[PDB]
Amino acid sequence: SDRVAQLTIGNSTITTQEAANIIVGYGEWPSYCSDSDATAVDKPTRPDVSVNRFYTLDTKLWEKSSKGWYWKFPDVLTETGVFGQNAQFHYLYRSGFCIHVQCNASKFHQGALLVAVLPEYVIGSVAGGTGTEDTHPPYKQTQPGADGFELQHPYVLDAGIPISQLTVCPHQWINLRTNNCATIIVPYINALPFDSALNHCNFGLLVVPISPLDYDQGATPVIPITITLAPMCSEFAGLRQAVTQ
Amino acid sequence: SDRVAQLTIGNSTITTQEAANIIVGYGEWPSYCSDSDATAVDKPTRPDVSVNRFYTLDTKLWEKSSKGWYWKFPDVLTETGVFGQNAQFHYLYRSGFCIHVQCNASKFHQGALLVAVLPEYVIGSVAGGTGTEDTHPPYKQTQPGADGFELQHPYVLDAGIPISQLTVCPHQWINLRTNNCATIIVPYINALPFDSALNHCNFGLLVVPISPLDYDQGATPVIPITITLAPMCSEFAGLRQAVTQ
Amino acid sequence: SDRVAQLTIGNSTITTQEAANIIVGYGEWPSYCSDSDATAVDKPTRPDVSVNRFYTLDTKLWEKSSKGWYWKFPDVLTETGVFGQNAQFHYLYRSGFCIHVQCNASKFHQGALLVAVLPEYVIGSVAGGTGTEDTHPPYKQTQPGADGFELQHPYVLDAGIPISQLTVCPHQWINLRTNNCATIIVPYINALPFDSALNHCNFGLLVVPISPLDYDQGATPVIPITITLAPMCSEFAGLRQAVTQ
Amino acid sequence: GDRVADVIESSIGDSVSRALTRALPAPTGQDTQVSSHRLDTGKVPALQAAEIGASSNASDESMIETRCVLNSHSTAETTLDSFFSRAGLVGEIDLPLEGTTNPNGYANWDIDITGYAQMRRKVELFTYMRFDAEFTFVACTPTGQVVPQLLQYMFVPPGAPKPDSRESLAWQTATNPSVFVKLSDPPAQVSVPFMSPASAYQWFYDGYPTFGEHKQEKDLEYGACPNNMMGTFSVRTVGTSKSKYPLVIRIYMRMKHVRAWIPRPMRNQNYLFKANPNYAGNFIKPTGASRTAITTL
């Protein structure tokens, strides 16, 4: 009654038979912007089912020596489908999200993934190691796209913040012994009712294996991690010609 | 609450801990012939517990290259116990059935059995391959007895009918990953209120493995399939001397 | 709802996820001595939480050739903690018990333990084999302490009583396929409202493997058996200087 | 007084014994009700779990198709008094003329019912037994002949002086109860109450009676229950001179008003000693008979 679940939105349906309940980010469901909070005067467009659907963006292979990966939102969808088209044609952006991470193994595999959502996850550079060099992460690292990016130092999350305290953010654990999926529902987290879907990344999703994957030789060595996500209550405003980046 | 079941009838009890619900053939429980449907004037005999009991008739070994088997009803019981004695001594026959197929394996075995009940399952011959020869199946093939008979061409069920459409008949699936038993309750299916239990076979039970059995070397290679069945609401009429065939 | 359980008493908590219900010895919960049953005139001391707690006394290794072990009560706790101190300082004794035997294995291990509580379990000697020698068991065998004692002839329980009838006493089965713990709650069983906690052993706990442990080579060969127990409604009376034995 | 919550709400002192079961009358065996074929899923009376330690509660109706039988078979004869209130041999006293055992014309028999397996196996089925006793003394010569001899049976409670001779001063029986009968008379029969200091006799006492080191010399004290030492039985031939006839005296005990507690497995090995569960170590025999193969009768 809590291990089996089915999430349907738009024209896509995601099922699961070994779920571990659903986390609502900060105990708040996604909702449309209230008229007392909106600041733009133009009437926003609400395409509804054409954008509020589960997008399966990429598949990452979990290995015994993996460090972890992170994705930026809504960067991952800035170039995907009708949602990406609307985000390119419209200046303003507002939506929630429903992130479903899939990672399935057998009863003889072991390992634990920490799936967390960190708002305004600003990536820092290693500052040339010693710290005397004022470097900045490249565009391909600050906005990795749909491929995500592999963490270099997951202990500090490449941002000087320990991962041991990452659980203060909305998070779920994919421990292969019990559950093979993590569901996090994240409302719009920003200091503004609307923001640019290209320049600003509202939050970053982190998938870091805390307990290394292990299995005896002979079992299936390819354990993929697949990210599936669906915007919720998406709004757009400030239409103009399309902008690619 | 649906995986564990116990069927008791007569003086026999069959239990199961990995059941997959019970199929009532055509949504109709076996019942005695109504006085507005009966045509014979003699009072039928209803031996009740002496014939309405679970008979375990034979055990077939499922192999990775098995084609499938079928049994004819009530041929399988024409020579078994008090039921067979009554069927031999009485001209007329009427009963339902409760067929319980047992096929148990481990969690590392795989395969799927299609257990279906096809009324008036007339077996045809291969017509000499080309089809220019007007052959008929032998007595040992049209009335195989308690040993059943192995299908030669399970794709056409040795009768020119595709097995892909066999599921339109009352059927259950024995998929070794979940369930190890199939229960089908079949009422009397005939155009007559009574019929001869020797000459006419009301229906045929088919057990055909659709997905071949597989397992790594080392596991138990003998996976038996056992048929257990119990007539329901059996009636008999037209008593005379016993007739063996 | 019956397989998961948690027993908390005093400042100790014991949990279990593969329990097999709880046996109350002779259908009677431990209770304090009634004023119509008490015979001593001094006011008994009831230390409560300082003695009514789960004591983990020793760990025995189950092997494929093990014969069985038994413990004597409250001998096992005569030298353990505040309970042992009170039992040494006080002449009289009265308490119930809650015995929790832990024996955990994997789904590929097999074996069955019979955990029973036999009141006034008097140990006899082999009488020199032939029976012409009037021997008595040594002190280390009649009062084994916290280490228990390994049975020499578990068939007769070293007392001339068949183990096949041992199930008439409060008992539970640790069959590794289903459950990994046995819980027995034993009230005070004696012909006296109070008795000496040093001289008299109210009951003996028997852990005898009826079906030998087995597993294929490669699995974990060390299968420990751990006894955890908690006195219930303990009373003490007749305080004097401490007595060690 | 009580002001702290952990004391006010404390369950300490609750002396009521919560009993999950209550005795119900059952004069006859349980009736069998009508049952029919039952074909349902989810609910299964046949599959049980002896793992729990409880006897399976599946009934006849829940397994096979049964008829309606009104069982009027009485359960009276299996009760404790019906099972135990039958006199059986518990002790034998020999009074020879010339011998080494009792050549003095008297014999002291320490009261214990563990000397004969017939009685011992029955009584040893339960750990604690509380009952009255009725003792009958059948005396006769070794040839089974009755002779005109007058005897005295004395009950000697623990602590009373044990007679040491046929003319000892203890035979004055000024306080001890004594029975004077002749062999020609019917066997003497008296009723003995429950005299144990404990609330019930205990046949097995897993402990020691006194503190201290239990060395080899102080090793026979294991298993001896002072609460079962009901005293000594003294018998003598009433006279100053030696009796003319040799006598053997058999004492039969019959319990009544029996109450029993804590059933235990019934003995399956030959008894060796009084008040001792010792068994022949090398001669351990199976409880039942054996057969050549398990697949054949």
Place this chain on the structure above:
Amino acid sequence: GDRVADVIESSIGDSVSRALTRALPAPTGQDTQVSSHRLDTGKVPALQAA
């Protein structure tokens, strides 16, 4: 007559055919009702058992 319980309470002779289903009129194809996004756990219409 009938005096034994196994005969008095017997279901022998019950000629009514217990039908778990009953025919319902369906002149046209079934209508499609409005549905919205549904994100809940424990309850799952998609997963079935053939």
